Coordinates of C-alpha atoms in Angstrom, one line a residue:
Chain A
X463 CA 0.0 0.0 0.0
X464 CA 2.8 2.3 0.9
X465 CA 6.0 3.3 -1.0
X466 CA 9.3 5.1 -0.4
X467 CA 10.3 3.3 2.8
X468 CA 11.2 0.1 1.0
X469 CA 13.2 2.1 -1.6
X470 CA 14.9 4.3 1.0
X471 CA 15.9 1.3 3.3
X472 CA 17.1 -0.7 0.3
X473 CA 19.2 2.2 -0.9
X474 CA 20.7 2.8 2.5
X475 CA 21.6 -0.9 3.0
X476 CA 23.1 -1.0 -0.6
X477 CA 25.2 2.0 0.3
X478 CA 26.6 0.3 3.3
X479 CA 27.2 -2.8 1.2
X480 CA 29.0 -0.7 -1.4
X481 CA 31.3 0.8 1.3
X482 CA 32.0 -2.7 2.6
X483 CA 32.5 -4.1 -0.9
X484 CA 35.2 -1.5 -1.5
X485 CA 37.4 -3.6 0.7
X486 CA 36.6 -6.7 -1.4
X487 CA 39.4 -5.6 -3.8
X488 CA 42.3 -7.5 -2.2
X489 CA 42.9 -10.7 -4.2
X490 CA 44.0 -14.0 -2.7
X491 CA 46.2 -15.5 -5.5
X492 CA 48.0 -14.7 -8.7
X493 CA 48.1 -16.7 -11.9
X494 CA 50.5 -15.0 -14.3
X495 CA 53.6 -15.8 -12.2
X496 CA 52.2 -19.3 -11.8
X497 CA 52.2 -19.7 -15.6
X498 CA 55.7 -18.3 -15.7
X499 CA 56.9 -20.8 -13.2
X500 CA 55.1 -23.7 -14.9
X501 CA 56.4 -23.0 -18.4
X502 CA 60.0 -22.3 -17.2
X503 CA 60.2 -25.4 -15.1
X504 CA 58.6 -27.6 -17.7
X505 CA 61.0 -26.5 -20.4
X506 CA 64.0 -26.8 -18.1
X507 CA 63.1 -30.3 -17.1
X508 CA 62.2 -31.4 -20.6
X509 CA 65.4 -30.2 -22.3
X510 CA 67.9 -29.3 -19.5
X511 CA 68.3 -26.0 -21.3
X512 CA 68.6 -24.1 -18.0
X513 CA 72.3 -23.5 -18.2
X514 CA 71.3 -20.9 -15.6
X515 CA 74.7 -19.5 -14.5
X516 CA 74.5 -16.0 -16.1
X517 CA 73.1 -12.7 -14.8
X518 CA 71.3 -10.0 -16.8
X519 CA 74.1 -7.5 -16.3
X520 CA 75.8 -8.6 -19.5
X521 CA 74.9 -10.2 -22.8
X522 CA 74.8 -14.0 -23.0
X523 CA 77.9 -15.6 -24.4
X524 CA 77.6 -18.0 -27.3
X525 CA 80.0 -20.4 -25.6
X526 CA 77.1 -21.3 -23.3
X527 CA 74.5 -21.8 -26.0
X528 CA 76.2 -23.3 -29.1
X529 CA 74.5 -26.7 -28.9
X530 CA 71.3 -24.9 -27.8
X531 CA 71.4 -22.9 -31.1
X532 CA 72.1 -26.1 -33.0
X533 CA 69.1 -27.8 -31.5
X534 CA 66.9 -24.7 -32.0
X535 CA 67.6 -24.9 -35.7
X536 CA 65.5 -28.1 -35.7
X537 CA 62.3 -26.3 -34.9
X538 CA 60.4 -23.6 -36.8
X539 CA 60.4 -20.1 -35.2
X540 CA 58.3 -18.0 -37.6
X541 CA 55.7 -17.6 -34.8
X542 CA 58.1 -15.6 -32.7
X543 CA 57.9 -11.8 -33.1
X544 CA 60.9 -9.4 -33.1
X545 CA 59.9 -6.8 -30.6
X546 CA 59.2 -7.3 -26.9
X547 CA 55.9 -6.8 -25.0
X548 CA 57.9 -5.4 -22.1
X549 CA 54.8 -3.9 -20.4
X550 CA 53.0 -7.2 -20.8
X551 CA 56.1 -9.2 -19.7
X552 CA 56.5 -7.3 -16.5
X553 CA 52.8 -6.6 -15.7
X554 CA 52.4 -9.3 -13.1
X555 CA 55.0 -7.7 -10.8
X556 CA 53.1 -4.5 -10.0
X557 CA 50.3 -6.4 -8.4
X558 CA 52.2 -7.0 -5.1
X559 CA 51.7 -3.7 -3.4
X560 CA 51.4 -5.1 0.1
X561 CA 48.9 -3.5 2.4
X562 CA 50.4 -0.6 4.3
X563 CA 54.1 -1.6 4.2
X564 CA 54.9 -5.1 5.3
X565 CA 58.6 -4.5 4.3
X566 CA 59.8 -1.5 2.3
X567 CA 62.4 -3.8 0.6
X568 CA 59.7 -5.2 -1.6
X569 CA 58.9 -2.0 -3.5
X570 CA 62.6 -1.0 -3.9
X571 CA 63.5 -4.5 -5.0
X572 CA 60.8 -4.3 -7.6
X573 CA 62.1 -0.9 -8.8
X574 CA 65.6 -2.2 -8.9
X575 CA 64.6 -5.3 -10.9
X576 CA 62.6 -3.2 -13.3
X577 CA 65.6 -0.9 -14.0
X578 CA 67.9 -3.9 -14.3
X579 CA 65.6 -5.3 -17.0
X580 CA 65.6 -1.9 -18.6
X581 CA 69.4 -1.8 -18.8
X582 CA 69.6 -5.4 -19.9
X583 CA 67.3 -4.9 -22.9
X584 CA 69.0 -1.6 -23.7
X585 CA 72.4 -3.4 -23.9
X586 CA 70.8 -6.2 -25.9
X587 CA 69.5 -3.7 -28.5
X588 CA 72.8 -1.8 -28.4
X589 CA 75.0 -4.8 -29.2
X590 CA 72.7 -6.5 -31.7
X591 CA 75.4 -6.9 -34.4
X592 CA 77.8 -8.1 -31.7
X593 CA 75.4 -11.0 -30.9
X594 CA 74.8 -11.6 -34.6
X595 CA 78.6 -12.1 -35.1
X596 CA 79.0 -14.2 -32.0
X597 CA 76.2 -16.6 -33.0
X598 CA 77.4 -16.6 -36.6
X599 CA 80.8 -17.9 -35.2
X600 CA 79.4 -21.4 -34.6
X601 CA 77.9 -21.5 -38.0
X602 CA 75.2 -19.7 -40.1
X603 CA 71.5 -20.4 -39.3
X604 CA 68.7 -19.4 -41.6
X605 CA 66.6 -18.3 -38.6
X606 CA 69.5 -16.6 -36.9
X607 CA 67.4 -13.6 -35.9
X608 CA 64.8 -15.9 -34.4
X609 CA 67.6 -17.7 -32.5
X610 CA 69.0 -14.4 -31.1
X611 CA 65.6 -13.1 -30.0
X612 CA 64.7 -16.5 -28.4
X613 CA 68.0 -16.7 -26.6
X614 CA 67.7 -13.2 -25.2
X615 CA 64.1 -13.7 -24.1
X616 CA 64.9 -17.2 -22.6
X617 CA 67.8 -15.8 -20.6
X618 CA 65.4 -13.1 -19.3
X619 CA 62.7 -15.8 -18.5
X620 CA 65.2 -17.8 -16.5
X621 CA 66.3 -14.8 -14.6
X622 CA 62.7 -13.8 -13.9
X623 CA 62.0 -17.3 -12.8
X624 CA 64.8 -17.0 -10.2
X625 CA 63.8 -13.5 -9.2
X626 CA 60.1 -14.2 -8.6
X627 CA 61.0 -17.5 -6.9
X628 CA 61.4 -15.3 -3.8
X629 CA 58.1 -13.4 -3.7
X630 CA 55.3 -15.8 -4.5
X631 CA 54.7 -16.3 -0.8
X632 CA 53.2 -12.8 -0.7
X633 CA 49.7 -11.8 -1.7
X634 CA 48.9 -10.1 -5.0
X635 CA 46.3 -7.4 -5.5
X636 CA 43.9 -6.6 -8.3
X637 CA 44.8 -2.9 -8.1
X638 CA 48.4 -2.5 -9.2
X639 CA 50.4 0.3 -7.6
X640 CA 50.4 3.6 -9.5
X641 CA 54.1 4.4 -9.1
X642 CA 55.3 0.9 -10.2
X643 CA 52.8 1.1 -13.1
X644 CA 54.2 4.5 -14.2
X645 CA 57.8 3.3 -14.1
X646 CA 56.8 0.2 -16.1
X647 CA 55.0 2.4 -18.7
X648 CA 57.9 4.7 -19.2
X649 CA 60.5 1.9 -19.4
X650 CA 58.3 0.1 -21.9
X651 CA 58.3 3.3 -24.0
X652 CA 62.1 3.4 -23.8
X653 CA 62.5 -0.3 -24.8
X654 CA 60.0 -0.2 -27.6
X655 CA 61.6 3.0 -29.0
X656 CA 65.0 1.4 -28.8
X657 CA 63.9 -1.7 -30.6
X658 CA 61.8 0.0 -33.3
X659 CA 64.8 1.8 -34.8
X660 CA 66.5 -1.4 -36.3
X661 CA 66.3 -3.7 -39.2
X662 CA 65.8 -7.5 -39.0
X663 CA 66.3 -10.2 -41.6
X664 CA 63.3 -12.4 -40.8
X665 CA 63.4 -15.8 -42.4
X666 CA 60.5 -18.1 -43.3
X667 CA 61.1 -21.8 -42.6
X668 CA 58.4 -23.6 -44.7
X669 CA 59.6 -27.1 -43.7
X670 CA 57.2 -28.8 -41.3
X671 CA 59.5 -28.8 -38.3
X672 CA 58.6 -30.9 -35.3
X673 CA 56.1 -29.2 -33.0
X674 CA 57.1 -29.5 -29.3
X675 CA 54.3 -28.5 -26.9
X676 CA 56.8 -27.1 -24.4
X677 CA 58.4 -25.1 -27.2
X678 CA 55.1 -23.5 -28.3
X679 CA 54.1 -22.8 -24.7
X680 CA 57.5 -21.0 -24.2
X681 CA 57.0 -19.1 -27.5
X682 CA 53.5 -17.9 -26.5
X683 CA 54.7 -17.0 -23.0
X684 CA 57.7 -15.1 -24.4
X685 CA 55.4 -12.8 -26.4
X686 CA 53.5 -12.5 -23.0
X687 CA 50.2 -13.9 -24.3
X688 CA 48.9 -15.9 -21.3
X689 CA 46.3 -17.9 -23.3
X690 CA 48.5 -21.0 -22.9
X691 CA 47.0 -22.9 -20.0
Chain B
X1 CA 23.7 19.8 -26.7
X2 CA 20.5 18.4 -28.2
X3 CA 20.9 14.9 -27.0
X4 CA 20.2 12.0 -29.3
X5 CA 17.2 9.9 -28.5
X6 CA 19.0 6.6 -28.0
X7 CA 20.9 7.6 -24.9
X8 CA 19.9 6.3 -21.4
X9 CA 21.7 8.0 -18.4
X10 CA 21.9 6.7 -14.9
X11 CA 23.4 9.0 -12.3
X12 CA 24.3 8.0 -8.7
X13 CA 26.8 8.9 -6.1
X14 CA 28.1 5.3 -5.8
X15 CA 29.3 5.1 -9.4
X16 CA 32.9 6.0 -8.5
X17 CA 33.5 2.3 -9.1
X18 CA 32.3 0.5 -12.2
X19 CA 28.8 -1.0 -11.7
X20 CA 29.3 -4.4 -13.3
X21 CA 25.9 -5.8 -12.2
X22 CA 24.0 -3.3 -14.2
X23 CA 25.6 -3.8 -17.6
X24 CA 23.5 -5.9 -20.0
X25 CA 23.5 -6.6 -23.7
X26 CA 21.2 -4.7 -26.0
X27 CA 19.2 -6.0 -29.0
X28 CA 18.8 -4.1 -32.3
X29 CA 16.0 -4.6 -34.8
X30 CA 17.9 -7.9 -35.7
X31 CA 16.6 -9.1 -32.3
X32 CA 20.0 -10.9 -31.7
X33 CA 21.8 -10.4 -28.4
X34 CA 25.1 -8.7 -29.0
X35 CA 28.0 -10.1 -26.9
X36 CA 30.9 -8.0 -28.1
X37 CA 31.0 -5.3 -25.5
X38 CA 33.1 -2.1 -25.8
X39 CA 33.7 0.3 -22.9
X40 CA 35.1 3.8 -22.7
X41 CA 36.8 5.6 -19.8
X42 CA 38.2 9.1 -19.2
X43 CA 41.9 8.3 -19.0
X44 CA 44.1 5.2 -19.4
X45 CA 44.4 5.1 -15.6
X46 CA 40.8 3.9 -15.1
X47 CA 41.5 0.9 -17.3
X48 CA 43.2 -0.6 -14.2
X49 CA 39.9 -0.8 -12.4
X50 CA 37.7 -2.7 -14.9
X51 CA 37.8 -6.5 -14.5
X52 CA 37.5 -8.5 -17.7
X53 CA 36.1 -11.3 -15.6
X54 CA 33.2 -9.4 -14.1
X55 CA 31.1 -9.8 -17.2
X56 CA 30.2 -13.5 -17.5
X57 CA 27.4 -12.8 -19.9
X58 CA 29.6 -11.2 -22.5
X59 CA 31.9 -13.2 -24.8
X60 CA 34.5 -10.5 -25.5
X61 CA 35.5 -7.2 -23.8
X62 CA 37.5 -4.3 -25.4
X63 CA 38.5 -1.2 -23.4
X64 CA 39.5 2.1 -24.8
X65 CA 40.5 5.5 -23.5
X66 CA 37.7 7.9 -24.5
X67 CA 39.6 10.4 -26.6
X68 CA 37.5 13.2 -28.0
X69 CA 36.7 13.1 -31.7
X70 CA 36.0 16.0 -34.1
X71 CA 34.9 14.4 -37.4
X72 CA 31.5 13.3 -36.0
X73 CA 28.9 15.6 -34.7
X74 CA 26.8 14.9 -31.5
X75 CA 23.6 15.5 -33.4
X76 CA 24.2 12.4 -35.5
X77 CA 26.4 10.0 -33.6
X78 CA 28.2 7.2 -35.4
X79 CA 26.4 3.9 -35.2
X80 CA 28.2 0.6 -34.8
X81 CA 25.4 -2.0 -34.5
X82 CA 28.0 -4.8 -34.1
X83 CA 28.8 -4.2 -30.4
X84 CA 27.1 -2.9 -27.3
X85 CA 28.7 0.3 -25.8
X86 CA 28.7 1.6 -22.2
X87 CA 30.3 4.9 -21.1
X88 CA 31.7 5.8 -17.7
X89 CA 31.8 9.3 -16.3
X90 CA 32.2 10.9 -19.8
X91 CA 33.7 14.4 -19.9
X92 CA 33.4 15.2 -23.6
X93 CA 30.4 14.9 -26.0
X94 CA 29.4 11.3 -26.6
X95 CA 30.1 10.4 -30.2
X96 CA 29.6 6.6 -30.6
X97 CA 26.3 4.7 -30.1
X98 CA 26.1 0.9 -29.9
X99 CA 23.2 -1.2 -31.0
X100 CA 20.0 -0.4 -29.3
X101 CA 20.3 1.0 -25.8
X102 CA 23.4 2.8 -24.7
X103 CA 23.7 3.4 -21.0
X104 CA 26.0 6.1 -19.5
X105 CA 26.8 5.6 -15.8
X106 CA 28.3 8.7 -14.4
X107 CA 28.7 10.5 -11.1
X108 CA 28.9 14.0 -12.8
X109 CA 26.1 15.6 -14.7
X110 CA 27.6 18.2 -17.1
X111 CA 25.7 20.2 -19.8
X112 CA 26.4 17.6 -22.5
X113 CA 24.0 15.1 -20.9
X114 CA 21.5 17.6 -19.5
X115 CA 18.9 17.2 -22.2
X116 CA 19.2 13.4 -22.4
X117 CA 16.9 11.2 -20.4
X118 CA 17.8 10.4 -16.8
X119 CA 17.3 7.9 -14.0
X120 CA 18.8 9.4 -10.8
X121 CA 19.6 7.0 -8.0
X122 CA 19.4 9.5 -5.1
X123 CA 21.0 9.1 -1.7
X124 CA 19.9 8.9 1.9
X125 CA 21.5 10.9 4.8
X126 CA 24.8 12.0 3.3
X127 CA 27.7 12.9 5.5
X128 CA 29.2 16.4 5.2
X129 CA 33.0 16.3 4.8
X130 CA 34.8 18.7 7.0
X131 CA 37.2 21.4 5.6
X132 CA 39.8 22.9 7.7
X133 CA 43.5 24.0 7.6
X134 CA 46.5 23.1 9.7
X135 CA 47.4 26.5 11.2
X160 CA 49.1 19.0 14.4
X161 CA 48.4 15.6 12.7
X162 CA 49.8 13.0 10.3
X163 CA 48.5 14.3 7.0
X164 CA 47.7 11.5 4.6
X165 CA 48.0 12.7 1.0
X166 CA 45.9 11.1 -1.7
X167 CA 46.3 10.8 -5.5
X168 CA 43.3 12.6 -6.7
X169 CA 43.4 11.5 -10.3
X170 CA 43.3 7.8 -9.1
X171 CA 41.3 7.8 -5.8
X172 CA 40.5 4.1 -6.3
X173 CA 44.0 3.2 -5.1
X174 CA 43.5 4.7 -1.7
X175 CA 40.0 3.4 -1.0
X176 CA 41.0 1.6 2.2
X177 CA 42.8 4.6 3.6
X178 CA 39.8 6.9 2.7
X179 CA 37.6 4.5 4.6
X180 CA 39.9 4.3 7.6
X181 CA 42.1 7.4 7.8
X182 CA 40.8 10.8 8.8
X183 CA 43.0 13.6 7.5
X184 CA 43.4 13.9 3.7
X185 CA 45.3 16.3 1.3
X186 CA 43.7 16.7 -2.1
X187 CA 46.6 16.7 -4.5
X188 CA 46.6 17.4 -8.2
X189 CA 49.2 17.2 -10.9
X190 CA 49.5 20.3 -13.1
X191 CA 48.6 18.0 -16.1
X192 CA 45.0 17.5 -15.2
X193 CA 42.6 19.6 -17.2
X194 CA 39.8 21.4 -15.3
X195 CA 37.2 18.7 -16.2
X196 CA 39.3 15.8 -14.9
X197 CA 40.0 17.7 -11.7
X198 CA 36.3 18.2 -11.3
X199 CA 35.6 14.6 -11.8
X200 CA 38.2 13.4 -9.3
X201 CA 36.9 15.9 -6.8
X202 CA 33.4 14.6 -7.2
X203 CA 34.6 11.0 -6.8
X204 CA 36.3 11.8 -3.5
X205 CA 33.4 13.8 -2.3
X206 CA 31.0 10.9 -2.9
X207 CA 33.4 8.6 -1.2
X208 CA 33.3 10.9 1.9
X209 CA 29.5 11.3 1.8
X210 CA 29.3 7.5 1.9
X211 CA 31.9 7.3 4.7
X212 CA 30.7 6.2 8.2
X213 CA 32.0 9.3 9.9
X214 CA 33.0 12.8 8.6
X215 CA 36.5 13.1 7.3
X216 CA 38.8 16.1 7.3
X217 CA 40.3 17.4 4.1
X218 CA 42.2 20.2 2.5
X219 CA 43.3 21.2 -1.0
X220 CA 46.9 22.0 -2.1
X221 CA 45.8 24.4 -4.9
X222 CA 45.6 28.2 -5.3
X223 CA 42.4 29.7 -3.8
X224 CA 41.0 31.0 -7.1
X225 CA 41.1 27.6 -8.7
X226 CA 39.3 26.2 -5.6
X227 CA 36.6 28.8 -6.0
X228 CA 36.3 27.9 -9.7
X229 CA 35.9 24.2 -8.7
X230 CA 33.3 25.0 -6.1
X231 CA 31.3 27.0 -8.6
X232 CA 31.4 24.0 -11.0
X233 CA 30.2 21.8 -8.1
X234 CA 27.4 24.2 -7.2
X235 CA 26.2 24.3 -10.8
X236 CA 26.5 20.5 -11.0
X237 CA 24.3 20.1 -7.9
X238 CA 21.9 22.6 -9.4
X239 CA 21.5 20.5 -12.5
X240 CA 21.1 17.4 -10.3
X241 CA 18.3 19.1 -8.3
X242 CA 16.6 20.2 -11.5
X243 CA 16.5 16.6 -12.6
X244 CA 14.9 15.6 -9.3
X245 CA 17.8 14.5 -7.1
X246 CA 17.2 14.6 -3.4
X247 CA 18.6 17.8 -1.8
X248 CA 21.9 17.5 0.2
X249 CA 22.5 19.8 3.1
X250 CA 26.2 19.3 2.6
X251 CA 27.7 21.9 0.3
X252 CA 30.8 24.1 0.0
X253 CA 31.2 27.5 1.5
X254 CA 32.4 30.6 -0.4
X255 CA 35.9 31.9 0.5
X256 CA 34.6 35.4 1.3
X257 CA 32.1 33.9 3.7
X258 CA 35.1 31.9 5.2
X259 CA 36.9 35.1 5.8
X260 CA 33.9 36.6 7.5
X261 CA 33.6 33.5 9.7
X262 CA 37.3 33.7 10.6
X263 CA 36.8 37.4 11.6
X264 CA 33.8 36.5 13.8
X265 CA 35.8 33.6 15.3
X266 CA 38.8 35.8 16.1
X267 CA 36.4 38.4 17.6
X268 CA 34.8 35.8 20.0
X269 CA 35.5 32.2 18.9
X270 CA 38.7 31.1 20.6
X271 CA 39.2 27.5 19.3
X272 CA 39.0 25.8 15.9
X273 CA 36.0 23.6 16.0
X274 CA 35.6 20.9 13.3
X275 CA 32.3 22.4 11.9
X276 CA 32.8 25.9 13.3
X277 CA 30.6 27.4 10.5
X278 CA 27.8 25.1 11.5
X279 CA 28.5 26.0 15.1
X280 CA 28.0 29.7 14.5
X281 CA 24.9 29.2 12.4
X282 CA 23.3 26.9 15.0
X283 CA 24.4 29.2 17.9
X284 CA 22.2 31.8 16.1
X285 CA 19.5 29.3 15.1
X286 CA 18.8 29.1 18.9
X287 CA 17.6 32.8 18.6
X288 CA 16.2 33.1 15.1
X289 CA 12.7 32.3 16.2
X290 CA 11.8 34.0 19.5
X291 CA 13.0 37.5 18.5
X292 CA 11.6 37.3 15.0
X293 CA 14.5 38.5 13.0
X294 CA 17.3 37.3 10.8
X295 CA 20.7 36.8 12.5
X296 CA 23.1 39.1 10.7
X297 CA 25.6 36.2 10.2
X298 CA 23.1 34.7 7.7
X299 CA 22.7 38.1 5.9
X300 CA 26.4 38.6 5.5
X301 CA 26.7 34.9 4.5
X302 CA 24.6 35.8 1.4
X323 CA 21.4 42.0 -5.1
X324 CA 17.9 40.9 -4.3
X325 CA 17.5 37.1 -3.6
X326 CA 16.5 38.2 -0.1
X327 CA 16.3 35.3 2.3
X328 CA 13.7 34.6 4.9
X329 CA 12.5 31.8 7.3
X330 CA 9.2 30.5 8.7
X331 CA 7.3 29.1 11.5
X332 CA 4.2 26.9 11.4
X333 CA 2.3 30.0 12.1
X334 CA 1.9 32.6 9.3
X335 CA 4.7 35.2 9.6
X336 CA 7.8 36.2 7.7
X337 CA 11.1 37.2 9.2
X338 CA 12.9 40.3 7.8
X339 CA 10.2 42.8 8.7
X340 CA 7.9 40.1 10.2
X341 CA 6.5 40.0 6.6
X342 CA 3.2 38.5 5.5
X343 CA 3.4 35.5 3.2
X344 CA 2.8 37.6 0.1
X345 CA 5.6 40.2 -0.4
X346 CA 6.9 43.7 0.4
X347 CA 3.8 46.0 0.7
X348 CA 3.6 48.7 -2.0
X349 CA 2.4 51.7 0.0
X350 CA 1.4 51.2 3.6
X351 CA 1.8 54.7 5.1
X352 CA 3.3 58.1 4.5
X353 CA 6.6 59.4 5.7
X354 CA 5.7 63.0 6.0
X355 CA 6.9 63.4 9.6
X356 CA 10.3 61.8 8.9
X357 CA 11.5 62.1 5.3
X358 CA 11.3 65.9 5.4
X359 CA 14.7 67.5 5.6
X360 CA 13.7 69.7 8.5
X361 CA 13.2 66.9 10.9
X362 CA 16.4 65.0 10.0
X363 CA 18.3 68.3 10.3
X364 CA 16.8 69.1 13.7
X365 CA 17.7 65.7 15.1
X366 CA 21.2 65.8 13.7
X367 CA 21.8 69.3 15.2
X368 CA 20.4 68.1 18.5
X369 CA 22.7 65.1 18.7
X370 CA 25.7 67.0 17.5
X371 CA 25.2 69.7 20.1
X372 CA 24.6 67.2 22.9
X373 CA 27.7 65.1 22.0
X374 CA 30.1 67.9 21.2
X375 CA 30.9 66.4 17.8
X376 CA 31.6 68.3 14.7
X377 CA 31.2 65.5 12.1
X378 CA 31.2 61.8 11.7
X379 CA 27.6 61.2 12.7
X380 CA 24.9 60.3 10.2
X381 CA 21.1 60.2 10.9
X382 CA 18.7 58.2 8.7
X383 CA 14.9 58.3 9.0
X384 CA 13.2 55.0 10.0
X385 CA 12.0 54.3 6.6
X386 CA 12.4 50.5 6.3
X387 CA 9.0 50.0 8.0
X388 CA 7.1 47.5 5.9
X389 CA 4.3 47.1 8.5
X390 CA 4.4 46.8 12.2

């Protein structure tokens, strides 16, 4: 018979529910890092390719990857791009803004790791012909550009595996930090600009090379597309 | 400004966050549900607060930063019947219409949407945020352009410092301010706040807010007793305080006004604080019985001609009284006499 009171009470209770549901944005688990760990560990176990004894501070040395390159010649690598989805690659990291500040070392370690990746990719772009020469030493390969890009991104993936092996205990969050996001955005700008000013001799391998599931998973993860699992 | 007839607008204070539950597909004349959903946002920052998993109904979701377009007029918006479209707090004229309905959920009601349809979700018992200034507390600054980051702090903490980059255009500043003000009005207890901007810009922002609330009221929104206070009025309040008010109360303006509310009625006159707080637009008050305030006016208006002023307005009487007071006091100048002429009716 009456009106208003129902609507007013419902609106008030919904307002209280909204102010409570604000706090619902906390997350309980991440998946991107889990995919990273899964793919890295699977490839390492399947092919022992984790000759993981090198840091990102310098370019990888062909002395540690000659047989790796020889094996890589077996597969086809036309699916692999040339540039890097740096923003996409490092997006999972920003999610770990701990509530208040559990330990300030977390944020600074994140910043330091981001800048380390920045310098690593800058050096990789800077010494591109150097790597072309070093990997032509062991013998020419039709997909030499694919091999170089894959080697660089695989070294980076192994290093990121080791780095993030130390943080997965913590809790992610749906809302990434603003500061970390801005740093990542500007660094992605820098990296993409550095890579876009080059020329690459892409090769098409029309032979039906053997398709390894771990290889294709690693390829898709490298280009940071997480539609793999 | 003449809004197209396909737009549906919902306005509510609690739209600072995206309202996932309310988004639904639309059907064109083809009578086929469209599952490709496209969304727009003011700045790329808001993209980081739209879950791609909060839309189980829809097959695919594409997000874009709403960047103003010039090649298409608002009179005849472009039609893309291949995807539903839903806007969020738009700040420039809408230019793209999806199939069938096109909802626009916003917390700000500018001129561009005024002539569209409307469904306001009004609010109950809003809290009034408290404005003050430091001249003893742990000030907690907040990123105004992205308030969604500091939601927990806003819920919990008390002091807050509005902070704006110089990049932000006026419109985005207004939108962020409205977001934070709605957050406060939904808060469980009043929160203290200040702005780190030049005073003139603060006045411009408050004028914008006043006109926004005027439009909201003209579309039927429930009135809110919480509103900003003009800076000149603030200076008057500070002078009154310094004259007699020793401390700095949280709602000292409300304190003054209620301290005179206690006397408005029995003496039947406006407290001069209200008068100075306000050409024409003369204010009054009421009781359940029929009587005005300023002269004890009848409910109609200022009477046109009630009685002559022969005994007063004549220069002889005013001069005689002036000479009498001057002689009695020993003055030579500095005293002015005015006839009692503002006598509407006893």
